[PDB]
Symmetry: C3
Subunit: 194 residues, 3 copies
């Protein structure tokens, strides 16, 4: 059940991050929806393609794109009203990074217990939405500008792999991977490691 | 037969748009061919990947890439001679948007009657070539800069789905989806909605 | 055995090119690793997706990503020490272009003897890593800025196809395709064709 919850958490968090980016770039409602939608679902779609899972879950399981839409719309309405309140793009991205590094590693592990597949596909699941967000926004992505960003995704997917290898129950393994990924991002941002 | 015709119309229209972009960015013959080729075939390739259709039709069915090549070459020669005549990049893109939103939704519908799959894959088929064109050109894509652009693709794929759901013959369903997509773009551009 | 060697040559060469790009853009160790890793393995991953080969070889065959990592790390250490020695990004890219145009055409040919599939997938394998490198770096890719770049990849994959069609042994066919691709790039760069 933790797996199902993490999919929704990551979709909402990445939708908020993509919608925030759109608002900061001056876009209006429909363009904000496009960037939130793409950021929220891109990581899962890329991950499914790499694992040969077609059609991708994000394009068939109705609650996922509906959630991406509604979270992006809520973000637009929020900042259309409250134009001068802070825009935590990086914290929204970091929560999504933990939710998808853990859930993305879990999906890769179900295909094969190859550590390279699990760690790299999990990390691609985690950063993929934000990479799409940043490329569509015509700027250098966070995976290059933030020194510890992509490696923290790699670490979070690796701790999922290790926990699963050590027979840790899937719910616990997802939670621990999420926690380490998010804590490492919080430390990077709050301690000015980047 | 409308399906087969729309594939050629969209390939030519998107090749012209990518070749025009290349000419406006100062590229020469071979670079113009690369951008026209990529714009014309990218949407179909991405769509095939999302539906698990490999190898993609655009890389096996000879008339499609030959058409992409010849339309891109014709565009280069035209503007090499007539340097000062108008460059209708957006109208070429809009005709392709209608041809591929309709044909791309048709392909997705043949895989499954899931409305989310049909609408989103159809829209990705429609905008994908231009997104590739704009990313390769190092600028923000039309799906973000034009407020009604991506939503009009979504609308056109949705009207295909509705028409097919209502048992409208495939030729008519493709034509109506094409028409609505193109008319909505014409209205957006001519009435300064964006 | 030439096929296996070319995979390592192209991975090392593209890793060096992506790591050099990262160093020139001011990134530190971990960001240099991310760009080298992505450049070295991206072409193979895209090529596998187009041919329906999942999971991609670069994410399961341990020596490939290990080689990408080690070559990127060696490049960072080299230029961290020797900051003022030349940075042959384009020569590293050109060696990879020949190694992957040949090996990528070979992989496509094993799926089908369709000349369009072999030539275009082979060329996408050859340029894909550098296109990813350039998009992540927020600039126009070499396939658009260098007039003879993408066409030379197309030529190299085509000479592989012709040699294989003429029953030339695979080792020789790979070597000849590699040679023509690399020689054509050397001529383009040394004779100021671009
Ligand atoms: Na840019
Ligand atoms: Na860019």
């Amino acid at each position: 059940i933790v797996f199902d919850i993490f999919n929704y958490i990551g979709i909402v968090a990445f939708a908020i991050s993509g919608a925030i980016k759109a608002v900061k770039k001056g876009m209006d409602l429909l363009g904000v929806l496009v960037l939130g939608f793409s950021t929220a679902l891109g990581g899962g779609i890329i991950s499914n393609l790499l694992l040969g899972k077609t059609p991708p879950t994000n394009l068939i399981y109705y609650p996922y794109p509906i959630t991406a839409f509604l979270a992006s719309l809520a973000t637009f309405v929020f900042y259309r009203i409250f134009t001068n309140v802070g825009k935590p793009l990086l914290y929204a991205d970091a929560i999504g990074l933990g939710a998808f590094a853990s859930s993305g590693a879990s999906l890769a592990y179900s295909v094969s217990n190859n550590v390279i597949l699990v760690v790299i596909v999990g990390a691609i699941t985690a950063v993929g939405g934000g990479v799409i967000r940043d490329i569509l926004s015509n700027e250098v992505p966070l995976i290059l500008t933030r020194e510890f960003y992509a490696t923290t995704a790699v670490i979070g997917s690796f701790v999922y792999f290790i926990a699963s290898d050590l027979s840790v129950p899937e719910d616990v393994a997802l939670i621990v991977s999420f926690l380490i990924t998010l804590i490492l991002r919080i430390l990077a941002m709050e301690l000015k490691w980047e």
